Structures are given as structure tokens and as C-alpha cells.
């Protein structure tokens, strides 16, 4: 039992304290006034961590760490209830997207991440309908697109305007994809619907790699 | 209530007559204590004797009678309860004989026949394990009844009027309930032919022959009974524990460390076969599935061609699972799509003479066609040519029918 054993274990748990506290407080650098309070529980442990003795560190620091966690629990509940209220009180779905793009890294903490599936699905049907509109409008072709005629008046070759059309549609789809993953978290295709929308956006993208047009033309 | 006070009066007068341990008056104290205590407690034995009548007066089987027999643990020091016990020794021994012969009937309907076979197999127990477990449970229940009779008289039940026959029934039933024969047959068969069945991991793929109409051939991986043998060894070890053949245990270990791969492969093969059944039961679908079917068979060829790739195994397994997974979703997806198409196609003679509705139908059908375009199937426009030709015929037919009818209207 080489003496440094519990020192090693202690160091890794204190690692996790600096790691996880540092993370959560570093995410609140994307902001109701519990920020300093998280830093208070953090420093509660930095003071009552008693400059990490070994014996009493076990027998007392267990409750010290736990105490800090309890303060994060309250911090969570307040942030989740707060954000669900700013989400529910958000009147626009785009506004709702802005709140999701306002807490990207906060939709990581499973504690937070659990209660949003309803709003998620509302946003998914929004994304759904708009990519469906892209299937529609892109299913109409560039020669018959009136955009070709307006672009032509703006004096471009039809070749260019056609690929501009294509490439821009691609950019809207890609923007939708980043909307999707920011909403659904980075584990996104693993999620029930993300796999589907991934496949669909990919095949839709494969029907947009226009280098052949430039080749033959 | 009535007896507690009685017993306590006897005790307190006896606690005073003991003279606080007068050994020199042990005759006086103890004998006098018995002079009063004996008679008063036997007067309590009268009410206990009413419950002695209740011993039979309560039950109908030796089980519940035995429960109340165990209830009176104080009375086994008094050979007065033994009288009614000797009276019900007959009934107790015969009822226990009833139960033991019932066990005989149960064992005679051995494990492959009894419902224990189905239930034990449902909970994934080998036939060896289920048989020997069931046998040892009956062994325990047999000795449990023997323990009941051991409590009945202690030792007189052995050379009893009928306990001499109970002993015989038990001895023959012990010889019936033997599992060393099964353990030996297990170690036997496994060491007679499963000596080579163990490490059959190399030839991963094996073609076949299936004498049926046309005499088809399928694909098969070589892990059918081995997995159950692994479960057999684990069951014997944790269950009873023998001097289990260590060579078989290590060969089982080697089968374990390669077993999940084979599971995945076997399910992929089965799903592949199921999909091929669904695909060739249809005919139009083949045109569009052709590419993916060739893809699946491309990886199937690359999987069969190699046998035992100790280094590259896991990625092939995962590639396989996803290919057949996709493939299956595509067939399901296409099936649903096609039936929506056909409800429109077969409904083209329903909405009589309405161009708007006709247009609507066609639009819906080609919405399904763009769905087909995205996850591109194989030869989609060719199949569309076919469609369009029959659509033209249903159209022109509905047309000419309405044409004639409108000629009579226009008369």
C-alpha cells in the first residue's frame, strides 16, 4: 500500500473538482445571478478543502465536495426553470432558436438537457417543413426557376447562376443542419430523428454536386 | 387469560418452595416442587390435550399437521403427546407416503416430458442443467419429507409399522434421482465428439445444401451447440461445481472470447435471408433494389472469402450489420412507398372524369418518386417508364369510356 495511494485518489477527485467546476462556471460566460454563487460554493470548497490534508480530507472533504454539489443542484434547477420560462415566454420560434444558440454548452449537462424534448420537437417540425420546402423549390429546376430570369437580368451566364442557385440552396441546408445540431446537441444523429435528417440532407446534398455541369459545359 | 395466571401461580409457589437452592433439602425443594408443579402443569396439559385432539382436528395432510406438530416443540419432552402421536403415526406416515409416491410419479415423467423442459428452456437453461436441477430439487423435497418423518418419532419412525416401507420408498427414489449418470454422459459426449466442436472459429463462413424443391443452399457460421455448452459449463460450475474437465473449460473460454462476433454475424445472415425472401417474393422491386442487393452481396463475398481474420474482424462485423440494417430499412421503406403508389394507380379508374383529382393523384405519386430519388434506388427511371405506360393505358381506357358516354350526352 504505497502511501501516496489516497493522495493519488484525492488528486483525481480534486482534478474533477477543478475540471467540472471550471467547466460549468466557464459556460456561464455565455450569459440568473447565481454565477458568483457557483464561485462561492467553489471557493467554499477552496477554503474548507483545508489545503487538502489526507486523513481529515477524507473524513471531512467528502461532505465539502458534496456541499458544493448541492449548491450546483440549486443552481441547475434555477437555470433550467429560468430558461424554460424564457423559452415558454419566447413568442417566436426563431427567438427560441436564439435561446438555443444562446446555451449550446448548457444543453450538455444531462440534468439540464432532460426537460426540453417538447420544445425540441417543435423546432424539429419547423426544420422539417423548411427542408421540405427546399426539396420542393429545388425540385423545380433552375431553367424554369424565375430566379434564373432575374439573375439573367442581373447578367450572369446561365451556368454560373445555376450553380449559384445550387450552392446557395446548399448553404441554407447546411445552416439548417447546424441549427439542428445546436438544438439537438452534438449527439444528434444518435437521437431518433437526427439519423433520418442526416441521411436526407446527405442525399439531397449529393443531388447538388454540380461539378459535372462545369465539366460538360 | 386463563392458563397464564395458572402457570404463574404454580411457578411463584414453586419459586418459593425451592428454598433458594437448598441442595441438602434437594429432596424437599425439588421433589416438593415436582409434587405441586407436576400436577398443576399436567392440569395445563389437559387443555394442551384438548389441543392434542385439535392436532388431527385441524388438517387433512401431513404438511399442515406437521406445521402444528412443529408448533409444540415443548411437548417433545413429554411422552404423553406421544400417545396421540402414535395414534396419528399411521395417518402421518401414510400421508407422507402419498406425497412421496406423488414425487415418484413426477420423476417418472422425466424432464424432457414435464413442463420443466419448456420453462427451463425459456429461462435459457440447457437440457443437462434443467434435468439435473429439477432432479436435485426433487431430491431436496424427498429429504424434506424425510426430515418431517425424522421429526415425527426421532428414531422410532425408522423401524416403524410403515416407516420401514417409507425407508424403502426413499432408498429406491434416491437411486432414481441420480445425476452423476447425467454428469458422466455430459462429460462423455463432450469428450467423445465435442473435442473438436470447441474451437470451430476458423471457417467462419460455410456454404450449404438443402434438399428441398430445387435443392437450395444457404450460408452458415459454425457456432450452433457450442454456445449452449458454454452455458452448460457455467451452470455446473456455479450450481454444483465438479472437477469439470479443465480442457473443456478453457476451450469454452476460447469460444466465449469470439462468441459475440458470431452472434452478430448469424443475425446478419438471418436478416439477409429474410430480406431476400421478401425481395424475390416481389418482382418489380428487384429493378430498384439491384444496386443495394449487389452491395450487400459484395460485402458478403468479402466476408465469405476470408475465414478467421484475427486482426480485422470487428470492423467487418459492424460494416455487415449496418449494410443489412440499411438494406432492410430500404426494402421496408420501398414496400410502403409502392403500396401508396399502387393505391393511386389502382384508384385511377375510381374518380370518374375529374382532371383536378387526376392531377392530384399524379402529384402524390411523383412525391413518392422524389423520395425514391433521394435515397437513390438502382434503375428508377426504367421502372418509371413501366409505370407511365400502364398509367397511359388506365388513362386512355378511362378516357375512351368517358368519350363514348360523352358522345351520347353530346347527341
Swiss-Prot record, chain B:
Chain residue ranges for the region called Interaction with DYNC1LI2 = 135-286
What results from changing residue 68 to L?
Answer: In SMALED1; disrupts dynein complex stability and function
Interaction with DYNC1I2, as annotated region? 1-187
Which compartments is it annotated to reside in?
Cytoplasm, Cytoskeleton
Q: What does this protein do?
A: Cytoplasmic dynein 1 acts as a motor for the intracellular retrograde motility of vesicles and organelles along microtubules. Dynein has ATPase activity; the force-producing power stroke is thought to occur on release of ADP. Plays a role in mitotic spindle assembly and metaphase plate congression.
Q: What is known of its domains?
A: Dynein heavy chains probably consist of an N-terminal stem (which binds cargo and interacts with other dynein components), and the head or motor domain. The motor contains six tandemly-linked AAA domains in the head, which form a ring. A stalk-like structure (formed by two of the coiled coil domains) protrudes between AAA 4 and AAA 5 and terminates in a microtubule-binding site. A seventh domain may also contribute to this ring; it is not clear whether the N-terminus or the C-terminus forms this extra domain.
Q: Which disease is it linked to?
A: Charcot-Marie-Tooth disease, axonal, type 2O: An axonal form of Charcot-Marie-Tooth disease, a disorder of the peripheral nervous system, characterized by progressive weakness and atrophy, initially of the peroneal muscles and later of the distal muscles of the arms. Charcot-Marie-Tooth disease is classified in two main groups on the basis of electrophysiologic properties and histopathology: primary peripheral demyelinating neuropathies (designated CMT1 when they are dominantly inherited) and primary peripheral axonal neuropathies (CMT2).
Give the family per the record. Belongs to the dynein heavy chain family.
Protein name from the UniProt record: Cytoplasmic dynein 1 heavy chain 1
Its source organism is Homo sapiens
Gene name, please? Answer: DYNC1H1
Part of the intact protein present: 517 to 927 of 4646
Amino acid at each position: 500500500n504505497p502511501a501516496h495511494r489516497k493522495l493519488q485518489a484525492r488528486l483525481d477527485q480534486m482534478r474533477k473538482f477543478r475540471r467540472q467546476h471550471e467547466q460549468l462556471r466557464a459556460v456561464i460566460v455565455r450569459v440568473a445571478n447565481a454565477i458568483e454563487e457557483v464561485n462561492l460554493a467553489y471557493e467554499n470548497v477552496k477554503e474548507v478543502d483545508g489545503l487538502d490534508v489526507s486523513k481529515e480530507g477524507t473524513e471531512a472533504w467528502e461532505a465539502a465536495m458534496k456541499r458544493y454539489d448541492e449548491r450546483i443542484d440549486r443552481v441547475e434547477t434555477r437555470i433550467t426553470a429560468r430558461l424554460r420560462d424564457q423559452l415558454g415566454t419566447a413568442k417566436n420560434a426563431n427567438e427560441m432558436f436564439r435561446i438555443f444558440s444562446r446555451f449550446n454548452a448548457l444543453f450538455v449537462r444531462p440534468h439540464i438537457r432532460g426537460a426540453i424534448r417538447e420544445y425540441q420537437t417543435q423546432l424539429i417540425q419547423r426544420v422539417k417543413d423548411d427542408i421540405e420546402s427546399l426539396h420542393d423549390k429545388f425540385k423545380v429546376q433552375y431553367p424554369q426557376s424565375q430566379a434564373c430570369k432575374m439573375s439573367h437580368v442581373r447578367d450572369l451566364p446561365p451556368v454560373s447562376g445555376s450553380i449559384i442557385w445550387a450552392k446557395q440552396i446548399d448553404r441554407q441546408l447546411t445552416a439548417y443542419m447546424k441549427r439542428v445540431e445546436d438544438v439537438l446537441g452534438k449527439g444528434w444523429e444518435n437521437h431518433v430523428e437526427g439519423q433520418k435528417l442526416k441521411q436526407d440532407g446527405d442525399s439531397f446534398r449529393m443531388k447538388l454536386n454540380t461539378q459535372e455541369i462545369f465539366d460538360d459545359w
